[PDB]
Design a protein around this ligand. Structure first.
Ligand SMILES: [Zn+2]
Ligand SMILES: [Zn+2]
Ligand SMILES: [Zn+2]
Ligand SMILES: [Zn+2]
Lengths: 246, 248
């Protein structure tokens, strides 16, 4: 599979768009998260939203859901196209009821539910989902905001995508040796102290063999200050297409 | 009575060359941001305006180009600045703005953050009443037609400037504004493409008498705006980030 980050930034970064990933596999294009910046980032990249076969949501924050409304309106009224919206089962209801409904509800046109704007595909956690031949997604519950459901993803039993995620030393080391992944893309908070995101200092406590697997994402505007100061880890370059083999 | 307005963005909801149509109003030392869309934090950053300099935000309706930036404001004001600013909301929108839009991302029950008032001083505004939100600065809401069945508002500022926000064309209301004395200036939603649905179009606005056109600057416009410079009758287009001054 290939991944191109349409943004690599933390939630309020001004030099980097929202941390949202364009995944390409066997002709399918999956957008992981769809923040307030996602339409602008795709437009800058020259990717029409009609080229997105599905959007998968990992948790409810503006840098992950705040672009869905623009997608929904343009796909309905300009293109007349239905794409898939993959939502963790626990987030299906709040994503509409408490986030998207305000702007997207249009009772007088019969648009009362999220399914009126997308083919909504609820994904149970801890089950492998083949969303396209050769492309599998497995949700892993992450810790981000206590009491709010958020997920990491294992892609093609090959790439672990943390999304927003507190540091879990034992889980990451177990990923390195269980064979379940060869690559890790991990949330990286550059400022101290550690609250709801893994910090660079925390990630630097990992063994070198795990660091060799890791590229860093969801980072703030001072990222350039830490180039060459991230151990054996590397920062993902915004808009670069990476290829992940095996 | 006098006030200034600087549009931090002048674009329609998906314009890629203009930020969301959100207005920075300056009056007697108070800074009011009218609407706070997905682009508002980036536009303020580009202008060098810290969000700590915003005394209040007023919301005219619930769409992402008007409310999608509030979450960032709320988080930064709470966790970085420890500051409370005012959030002015039409009374009919107070509940849905939280319940159906902002709650998903901002609710944090384990920290005791269960309502919009935990992130702002929420000030509910009844329509058709004049509100003095700061000495010398008054706002009067006027129900607009935008999405049928959804509450949306235009605003009269300082009994001087009519700010349409998102608004279908209303010939009689605009001509009445031009002659009643209730305003001297109109800032109006302008859709450049045909046909008209939920926004006034340029062709509709060009049916207004010349005397009313002379009162109007155009906003909330799409990326083709530059093709229409010099082709808007006696109206003209608001320039993004220009500070306009309104008097008398
Ligand atoms: Zn995030
Ligand atoms: Zn988050
Ligand atoms: Zn709008
Ligand atoms: Zn609108």
């Amino acid at each position: 599979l290939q991944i191109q980050m349409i943004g690599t930034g933390s939630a309020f970064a001004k030099k980097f768009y929202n941390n949202n990933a364009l995944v390409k596999c066997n002709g399918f294009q999956l957008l992981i998260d769809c923040g307030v910046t996602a339409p602008r980032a795709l437009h800058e990249l020259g990717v029409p939203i009609t080229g997105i076969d599905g959007i998968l949501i990992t948790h409810i924050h503006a840098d992950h859901v705040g672009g869905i409304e623009e997608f929904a309106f343009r796909l309905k009224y300009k293109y007349g196209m239905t794409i898939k919206l993959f939502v963790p089962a626990a987030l299906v209801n709040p994503l509409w009821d408490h986030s998207l409904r305000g702007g997207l509800e249009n009772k007088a046109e019969g648009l009362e539910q999220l399914a009126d704007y997308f083919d909504v595909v609820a994904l149970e956690e801890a089950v492998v989902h083949e969303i396209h031949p050769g492309l599998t997604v497995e949700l892993v519950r992450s810790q981000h905001i206590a009491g709010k459901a958020s997920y990491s993803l294992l892609l093609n039993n090959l790439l672990f995508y943390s999304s927003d995620a507190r540091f879990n030393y034992a889980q990451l080391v177990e990923l390195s040796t269980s064979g379940r992944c060869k690559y890790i893309l991990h949330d990286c908070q550059l400022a101290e102290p550690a609250a709801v995101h893994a910090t660079l200092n925390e990630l630097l406590t990992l063994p070198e063999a795990v660091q060799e697997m890791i590229m860093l994402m969801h980072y703030d505007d001072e990222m350039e200050q830490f180039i060459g100061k991230s151990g054996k880890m590397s920062f993902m370059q915004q808009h670069k297409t990476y290829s992940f083999t095996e």
